[PDB]
Design a binder for this molecule. Structure first.
Ligand SMILES: Nc1ncnc2c1ncn2[C@@H]1O[C@H](COP(=O)(O)O)[C@@H](OP(=O)(O)O)[C@H]1O
Length: 295
């Protein structure tokens, strides 16, 4: 009830970044967040594989036992750092304060406004990038169904907001590039959603090594089996079907939507794809960071 007035409102702004309206008040809780050096941060631009990687990290920390991961929804097992629902739930930061190490922290903040404490404590960051076209489709449908978001209107107007960085958490170009560069000064494992669709066990292995964990071949196969898109769409612990429909309208668009690489071809018009590609080449000039739009 109290949170209703924050739902479906236009973006606020925190440190020059568009922010979910409900998340923006009381932002000192984020700026002053107290990290621990053993914290694992799962950082992504929205709709780039946060839930996927979070479940993989949790599974690795439980020794590859999928039963352990069903003790709670992924939204509670891996709290989102900046999440808040004023008057309805405790913030993500308050939940994380009461969580035993090793904490898994999910966040969508760009690198330059991720809380300083994370950088000073050298916390291991697992970043996931996804090609901007699939992200924009996924983010558009997410906004149609997630009532925390300002309504996206039509797809063509949303896409224009997306390319301009006028969506929640700002420019995708600055986001993916910010963490790609910050790895020169911080332990960052930079993953690619498309690499995970192509070869999931290979990417789980890289996450396990980064976390200093050793997996038997059985544990690895068990983690690959339960972190398929099909395993996670039907798992109530990962598919967000436990979120009340008042906050996430699962009928409009399910959270576990398509889970593929290349869905952008079913939504980008011929003209949209031409304009997006020129702007993308302009905006992604001068970086060695490369994304794949098909595999
Ligand atoms: N195990 C998995 N395999 C593939 N895609 C997955 C996945 N788990 C989630 N996804 C996809 O990742 C996106 C959500 O990313 P995030 O967790 O950061 O919000 C959605 O993309 P789609 O909307 O294209 O289906 C969702 O379907």
């Amino acid at each position: 009830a109290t949170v209703d007035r924050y739902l479906r409102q236009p973006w606020s702004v925190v440190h020059g970044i568009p922010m979910v309206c409900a998340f923006a008040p009381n932002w000192e809780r984020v700026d002053n967040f107290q990290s621990r050096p053993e914290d694992i941060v799962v950082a992504t631009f929205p709709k780039s594989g946060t839930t996927w990687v979070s479940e993989i990290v949790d599974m690795i920390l439980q020794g590859g036992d999928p039963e352990k991961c069903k003790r709670d929804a992924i939204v509670n097992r891996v709290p989102m750092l900046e999440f808040a629902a004023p008057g309805e739930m405790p913030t993500g930061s308050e939940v994380l304060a009461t969580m035993p190490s090793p904490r898994v922290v999910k966040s969508h903040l760009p690198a330059h406004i991720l809380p300083k404490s994370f950088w000073d404590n050298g916390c291991k960051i697992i970043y996931v990038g996804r090609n901007a076209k699939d992200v924009a489709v996924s983010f558009y449908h997410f906004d149609l169904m997630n009532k925390f978001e300002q309504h996206p209107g039509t797809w063509d107007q949303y896409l224009e907001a997306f390319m301009a960085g006028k969506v929640a958490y700002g420019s995708w170009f600055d986001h993916v590039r910010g963490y790609w560069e910050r790895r020169q000064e911080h332990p960052i494992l930079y993953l690619f959603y498309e690499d995970m669709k192509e070869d999931l066990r290979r990417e789980i292995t890289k996450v396990a090594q980064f976390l200093g964990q050793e997996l038997t071949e059985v544990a690895l196969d068990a983690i690959a089996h339960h972190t398929s898109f099909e395993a996670m769409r039907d798992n109530p612990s990962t598919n967000y079907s436990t979120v009340p429909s008042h906050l996430m309208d699962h009928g409009v668009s399910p959270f576990m939507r398509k889970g593929i690489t290349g869905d952008w071809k079913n939504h980008f018009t011929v003209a949209q794809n031409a304009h997006f590609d020129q702007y993308y080449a302009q905006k992604m000039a001068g970086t060695d960071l490369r994304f794949r739009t098909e595999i």
